[PDB]
Write a protein that holds these residues in place. Structure first.
Motif, PDB file in Angstrom:
ATOM      1  N   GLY A  26       0.761  -1.235   0.000  1.00 45.45           N
ATOM      2  CA  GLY A  26       0.000   0.000   0.000  1.00 45.45           C
ATOM      3  C   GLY A  26       0.798   1.296   0.000  1.00 45.45           C
ATOM      4  N   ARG A  27       0.952   1.877   1.197  1.00 47.84           N
ATOM      5  CA  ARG A  27       1.680   3.134   1.402  1.00 47.84           C
ATOM      6  C   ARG A  27       1.073   4.290   0.570  1.00 47.84           C
ATOM      7  NH1 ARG A  27       8.195   3.319   2.414  1.00 47.84           N
ATOM      8  NH2 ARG A  27       8.259   5.540   3.026  1.00 47.84           N
ATOM      9  N   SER A  28      -0.246   4.253   0.379  1.00 42.96           N
ATOM     10  CA  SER A  28      -0.985   5.321  -0.279  1.00 42.96           C
ATOM     11  C   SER A  28      -2.018   5.905   0.693  1.00 42.96           C
ATOM     12  CB  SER A  28      -1.645   4.800  -1.560  1.00 42.96           C
ATOM     13  OG  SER A  28      -0.753   3.949  -2.279  1.00 42.96           O
ATOM     14  N   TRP A  29      -2.511   7.114   0.387  1.00 46.00           N
ATOM     15  CA  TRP A  29      -3.509   7.790   1.223  1.00 46.00           C
ATOM     16  C   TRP A  29      -4.314   8.790   0.393  1.00 46.00           C
ATOM     17  CZ3 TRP A  29      -7.001   7.903   4.654  1.00 46.00           C
ATOM     18  CH2 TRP A  29      -6.856   7.409   5.950  1.00 46.00           C
ATOM     19  N   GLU A  30      -5.405   9.307   1.001  1.00 46.12           N
ATOM     20  CA  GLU A  30      -6.281  10.296   0.368  1.00 46.12           C
ATOM     21  C   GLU A  30      -7.392  10.866   1.278  1.00 46.12           C
ATOM     22  OE1 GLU A  30      -9.648  10.111  -2.092  1.00 46.12           O
ATOM     23  OE2 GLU A  30      -8.424   9.971  -3.930  1.00 46.12           O
ATOM     24  N   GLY A  31      -8.632  10.618   0.894  1.00 45.78           N
ATOM     25  CA  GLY A  31      -9.923  10.793   1.534  1.00 45.78           C
ATOM     26  C   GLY A  31     -10.560  12.129   1.244  1.00 45.78           C
ATOM     27  N   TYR A  32     -11.905  12.146   1.271  1.00 44.98           N
ATOM     28  CA  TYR A  32     -12.745  13.340   1.179  1.00 44.98           C
ATOM     29  C   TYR A  32     -13.668  13.450   2.393  1.00 44.98           C
ATOM     30  CZ  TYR A  32     -15.848  16.923  -0.746  1.00 44.98           C
ATOM     31  OH  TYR A  32     -16.600  18.055  -0.928  1.00 44.98           O
ATOM     32  N   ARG A  33     -13.600  14.599   3.101  1.00 38.02           N
ATOM     33  CA  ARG A  33     -14.324  14.822   4.370  1.00 38.02           C
ATOM     34  C   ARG A  33     -14.101  13.655   5.320  1.00 38.02           C
ATOM     35  NH1 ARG A  33     -18.010  19.448   3.873  1.00 38.02           N
ATOM     36  NH2 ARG A  33     -18.971  19.536   1.795  1.00 38.02           N
ATOM     37  N   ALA A  34     -12.898  13.080   5.253  1.00 35.17           N
ATOM     38  CA  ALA A  34     -12.680  11.789   5.876  1.00 35.17           C
ATOM     39  C   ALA A  34     -12.635  11.872   7.389  1.00 35.17           C
ATOM     40  CB  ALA A  34     -11.394  11.159   5.346  1.00 35.17           C
ATOM     41  N   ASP A  35     -12.584  13.075   7.961  1.00 36.81           N
ATOM     42  CA  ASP A  35     -12.672  13.222   9.407  1.00 36.81           C
ATOM     43  C   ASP A  35     -13.965  13.875   9.857  1.00 36.81           C
ATOM     44  OD1 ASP A  35      -9.971  12.182   9.824  1.00 36.81           O
ATOM     45  OD2 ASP A  35      -9.399  14.072   8.813  1.00 36.81           O
ATOM     46  N   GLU A  36     -14.925  14.032   8.963  1.00 35.84           N
ATOM     47  CA  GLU A  36     -16.240  14.462   9.373  1.00 35.84           C
ATOM     48  C   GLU A  36     -17.042  13.240   9.802  1.00 35.84           C
ATOM     49  OE1 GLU A  36     -18.573  17.254   7.182  1.00 35.84           O
ATOM     50  OE2 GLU A  36     -16.767  17.964   6.089  1.00 35.84           O
ATOM     51  N   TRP A 222     -10.606  -7.242  -2.810  1.00 34.21           N
ATOM     52  CA  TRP A 222      -9.357  -7.834  -3.274  1.00 34.21           C
ATOM     53  C   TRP A 222      -9.326  -7.735  -4.791  1.00 34.21           C
ATOM     54  CZ3 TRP A 222     -12.273  -9.708   0.622  1.00 34.21           C
ATOM     55  CH2 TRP A 222     -11.655  -9.904   1.855  1.00 34.21           C
ATOM     56  N   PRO A 223      -8.661  -6.738  -5.370  1.00 31.98           N
ATOM     57  CA  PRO A 223      -8.405  -6.764  -6.819  1.00 31.98           C
ATOM     58  C   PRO A 223      -7.602  -8.002  -7.179  1.00 31.98           C
ATOM     59  CG  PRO A 223      -8.014  -4.577  -5.942  1.00 31.98           C
ATOM     60  CD  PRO A 223      -8.169  -5.491  -4.754  1.00 31.98           C
ATOM     61  N   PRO A 224      -7.563  -8.389  -8.457  1.00 30.16           N
ATOM     62  CA  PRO A 224      -6.787  -9.582  -8.824  1.00 30.16           C
ATOM     63  C   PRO A 224      -5.302  -9.342  -8.581  1.00 30.16           C
ATOM     64  CG  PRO A 224      -8.429  -9.100 -10.488  1.00 30.16           C
ATOM     65  CD  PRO A 224      -8.338  -7.884  -9.601  1.00 30.16           C
ATOM     66  N   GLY A 225      -4.712 -10.182  -7.724  1.00 34.00           N
ATOM     67  CA  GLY A 225      -3.298 -10.118  -7.397  1.00 34.00           C
ATOM     68  C   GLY A 225      -2.869  -8.807  -6.774  1.00 34.00           C
ATOM     69  N   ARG A 226      -3.614  -8.357  -5.765  1.00 34.93           N
ATOM     70  CA  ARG A 226      -3.307  -7.127  -5.055  1.00 34.93           C
ATOM     71  C   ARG A 226      -3.712  -7.278  -3.596  1.00 34.93           C
ATOM     72  NH1 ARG A 226      -5.163  -1.399  -7.456  1.00 34.93           N
ATOM     73  NH2 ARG A 226      -4.025  -0.912  -5.525  1.00 34.93           N
ATOM     74  N   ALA A 227      -3.052  -6.498  -2.744  1.00 36.73           N
ATOM     75  CA  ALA A 227      -3.464  -6.384  -1.350  1.00 36.73           C
ATOM     76  C   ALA A 227      -4.886  -5.832  -1.266  1.00 36.73           C
ATOM     77  CB  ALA A 227      -2.514  -5.460  -0.586  1.00 36.73           C
ATOM     78  N   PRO A 228      -5.685  -6.266  -0.287  1.00 34.00           N
ATOM     79  CA  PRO A 228      -7.053  -5.750  -0.191  1.00 34.00           C
ATOM     80  C   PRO A 228      -7.067  -4.247   0.038  1.00 34.00           C
ATOM     81  CG  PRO A 228      -6.486  -6.962   1.781  1.00 34.00           C
ATOM     82  CD  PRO A 228      -5.389  -7.224   0.787  1.00 34.00           C
ATOM     83  N   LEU A 229      -8.178  -3.639  -0.357  1.00 35.70           N
ATOM     84  CA  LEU A 229      -8.423  -2.216  -0.212  1.00 35.70           C
ATOM     85  C   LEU A 229      -9.651  -2.096   0.658  1.00 35.70           C
ATOM     86  CD1 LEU A 229      -7.169  -2.299  -3.381  1.00 35.70           C
ATOM     87  CD2 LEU A 229      -7.258   0.132  -2.878  1.00 35.70           C
ATOM     88  N   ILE A 230      -9.627  -1.193   1.629  1.00 35.09           N
ATOM     89  CA  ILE A 230     -10.774  -0.991   2.505  1.00 35.09           C
ATOM     90  C   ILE A 230     -11.411   0.323   2.098  1.00 35.09           C
ATOM     91  CG2 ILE A 230     -11.620  -0.702   4.869  1.00 35.09           C
ATOM     92  CD1 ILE A 230     -10.399  -3.247   5.148  1.00 35.09           C
ATOM     93  N   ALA A 231     -12.716   0.305   1.795  1.00 37.37           N
ATOM     94  CA  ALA A 231     -13.372   1.544   1.409  1.00 37.37           C
ATOM     95  C   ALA A 231     -14.570   1.794   2.296  1.00 37.37           C
ATOM     96  CB  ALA A 231     -13.810   1.542  -0.047  1.00 37.37           C
ATOM     97  N   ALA A 232     -14.739   3.057   2.671  1.00 39.07           N
ATOM     98  CA  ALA A 232     -15.889   3.518   3.432  1.00 39.07           C
ATOM     99  C   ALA A 232     -16.446   4.738   2.711  1.00 39.07           C
ATOM    100  CB  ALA A 232     -15.503   3.843   4.881  1.00 39.07           C
ATOM    101  N   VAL A 233     -17.698   4.640   2.260  1.00 36.73           N
ATOM    102  CA  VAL A 233     -18.364   5.693   1.506  1.00 36.73           C
ATOM    103  C   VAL A 233     -19.707   5.972   2.159  1.00 36.73           C
ATOM    104  CG1 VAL A 233     -19.265   6.477  -0.700  1.00 36.73           C
ATOM    105  CG2 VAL A 233     -17.195   5.083  -0.598  1.00 36.73           C
TER     106      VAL A 233
END
Length: 258
Positions: A26-36, A222-233
């Protein structure tokens, strides 16, 4: 960005407040209003199950413990728990019911097992979540009057927490694979993420619907051959129909696969 323009446009077109967080494990980041704060709606049910599994792991609870309950206890939307007024259900069956069908009585029976909403908040702090709180039972918790902090998460806290539960060390390997299996078997969120999700990818998810226009989804993918991604929308404070609201969460989840 540009996934940022879609979110900003959805707020402007729908008159909604959107929260998005994604965690690449991973080692990626982002988010929108992610602390509201956003109303959890039925996405809290993932958390109550992890709470109950954590107690099982500590020898403090039994997945086979049978809960016998009555019909004044049934709350609206009890697709499974109604069919078992006679025999009852085991805690394992109840967990299956809430994750898989979003059954509201099974949720309340699990909250009662844990010791109420205030006790789920204590588990959440114990596993590192300083913000997410549960305060009511189903169905009161979906009220979602704007500015009320009860029954809320933040997209950053919820994505973090789901990671600690599903991939972190807060739960036993047996408990994680139970929760993940339940989430992969979810049945009430179809179009919000799964529908636009390419074939070959695995998604476990849980979706929520709630008053004032609240719609939410948490997912491990789990994309094909990738570490899982956790999403909250999360989407709330909108007057759009369940249709334009479903189509915007799906449109945000689609943009995330890019």
């Amino acid at each position: 960005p540009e996934t940022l323009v879609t979110v900003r446009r959805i707020e402007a077109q729908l008159g909604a407040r959107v929260g998005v967080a994604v965690l690449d494990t991973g080692r990626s980041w982002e988010g929108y209003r992610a602390d509201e704060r956003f109303p959890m709606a039925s996405t809290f049910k993932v958390l109550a199950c992890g709470a109950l599994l954590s107690r099982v792991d500590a020898g403090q609870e039994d997945l086979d413990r049978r809960i016998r309950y009555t019909q004044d206890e049934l709350v609206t939307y009890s697709p499974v728990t109604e069919k078992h007024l006679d025999d009852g259900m085991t805690l394992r069956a109840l967990c299956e019911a809430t994750i898989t069908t979003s059954d509201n009585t099974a949720a309340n029976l699990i909250l009662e097992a844990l010791g109420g909403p205030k006790a789920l908040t204590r588990f959440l702090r114990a596993i590192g979540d300083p913000v997410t709180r549960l305060d009511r039972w189903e169905t009161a918790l979906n009220e979602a009057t704007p500015g009320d902090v009860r029954d809320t998460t933040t997209p950053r806290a919820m994505a973090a927490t789901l990671r600690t539960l599903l991939l972190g060390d807060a739960l036993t390997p047996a408990s994680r694979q139970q929760l993940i299996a339940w989430l992969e078997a979810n049945q009430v969120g179809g179009p919000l993420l799964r529908a636009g999700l390419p074939a070959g990818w695995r998604i476990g998810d849980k979706t929520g619907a709630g008053g004032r226009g609240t719609r939410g989804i948490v997912a491990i993918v789990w994309p094909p051959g990738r570490a899982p991604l956790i999403a909250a929308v999360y989407l709330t404070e909108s007057e759009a129909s369940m249709d334009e609201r479903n189509a915007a969460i799906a449109e945000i989840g689609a943009a995330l696969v890019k």
